[PDB]
Every structure is written in C-alpha cells, then in structure tokens.
Write an enzyme that holds these catalytic residues in place. Sequence first.
Site: not given
Length: 334
Positions: A45, A136, A246
Amino acid sequence: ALTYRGADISSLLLLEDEGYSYKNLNGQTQALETILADAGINSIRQRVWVNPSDGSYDLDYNLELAKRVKAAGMSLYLDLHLSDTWADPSDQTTPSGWSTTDLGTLKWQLYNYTLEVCNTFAENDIDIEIISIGNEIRAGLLWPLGETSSYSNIGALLHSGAWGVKDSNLATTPKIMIHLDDGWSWDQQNYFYETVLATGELLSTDFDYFGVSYYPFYSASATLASLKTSLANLQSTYDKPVVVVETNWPVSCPNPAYAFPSDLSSIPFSVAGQQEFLEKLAAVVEATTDGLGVYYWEPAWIGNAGLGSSCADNLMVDYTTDEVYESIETLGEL
C-alpha cells in the site's frame, strides 16, 4: 490464507535515501520489498499526495517505489490522500491549486487527477489492484466543499474520482475502495454510507471495496468483538468485500495514553504479542464473509517507531540491528 497480506511502506524511499538498509531474517542486507515478498507479503500500500512542495509521496515518488513493488511480483494498492499533506478526519485540506469555491471545477479537477494518475501508471506498465478515493474520509474530504455539512457534495466528489479511474487507460480497472477510520465502530461506518448513498450522488456501483483502519491504542472501545460485528455488518448490508487497510501492534509501549480494548488486554508488547495480535486479527477477517485481508502500516519506518501513537515502538524491524522481526513471517502467512 488471507487474500491480501500486505504492508504500507511508503516511507521506504526517504529512508533508503538516508543510508538505511534492511537485513532479512538471516542477517543478510537485502531490498526490503524482496524481504517482504519472500516472507509472503502479498501487496503493498502506498500513500499519494497531490502537490507537496517538497515532492514527498508525490506521483514521481510512487512510480519509483511501484516499479520495485512490481519487480517483486506484489500487487499495488494506491491510497490517494487527495491532499498535499497528511489527510485524516481532522484534516482534509484541498490540494494547493485545486478549488475551494466551486464544486463543478473541483469535481473536474478530481476526475482529471485520478484519471491522470491511472493513465501514468498505464504508461509505465504498472497494474493497480486497489485504489482508494481519499484516506479516512469519515469527516468528508476536500474541505470546505466536502465538509460533512454536505454529504451530497461528498457523494458528488467520490463519484467523480471513481469515474476518473473507471475511464482511465488501465488495461484492467483497479478495485475502487472507500476508506474510513475507526473500523471497529459500526454506527459510524453505517452512518457514513447510509447517508452519502441516500443522496444518490454516489452509486453502489461506483466502488468495489470497503476499507477500514483498525488500531488498538486510541480507545478501549476498539475491541476485536466490535470490529468483527462492524465488519460482518458492512459486508451483509452493502454486499461488498472488506479490508483492514491499516493496523499496528506495539513491540514496546511503556505508557499508553488510553487503556487497550478488553479482549486485547492479554496480548503482550513484544514481537510475540505482535504475532499473536495479527493471528487473532486475521481469524476475525478470515471468519468474515468477504474479508479480503490486512495491511500493516509502516512496519519499517526507522526513526518514527511510535508511528504517531502514544506507544514507543510499532515497527516490525529491530530498530537497532536493522534486522526484520519474525513477525514479518507471521503477516505473510495469515
């Protein structure tokens, strides 16, 4: 085994450019990406910033890093922050040069951007497995136009970015992900999606994956039980796969700001604890209907061991010997 067993190592290039080299489990120096690849890490990522004044994590940076991730046969997951710096629920600053006053112009800039980013990877012959439109975005994105005071604007912007990649030249169009923080909270996950979709500005067919962040040291409320339930609900309600994009576990945490969730209280702060948490975490993901995987966040960021948390060390690399920890192998076999 989990469909995706990855890590975010976006800082790799700035570290190497600082004389940092890693030793594998056998004490031999070796390109971190190759160490991870052999250890079983599936995908990598990488965070992308739009116009950072210093070039940090910009497109050129990610192309450099993505060539090597491709070299090692790992899939690519681009985490677009749609900002010039760190984007999160507390800060979603629109890229310098982009519009903070006209949604038409901003929807257009976002579409051209995601399209150019994808077209550039296609030019370099690099496939992209996953692409998140924003990082997010629970409190929205691209403020002020995308403040949550307008889920309509938020839906319009997400739709636009999604079509930029759908319309790109990528032989295969990447899986589009929407990433929210606090993945253990079902009410927040639900509220966000239920709301933005009700506007009709963003369609169910605009994105493929759900991505959630999951940390144990920002609230005792982040139990594995809550996550398991939020994960299962997200999947059954909207019928889309779920990925934990995450996470971290400390090998050392002398004075945490908050109490750790109750069902994670028994896990120790050591390399073995790390290994135990990952396994307990993979089991919940694996036990979920369309649970695709887990990504560890920045396991090799030497110099930023705490990784932003109140804990001392969340790395998966011995910060003194530069040797990866055995937990690298655990992540690779989840």
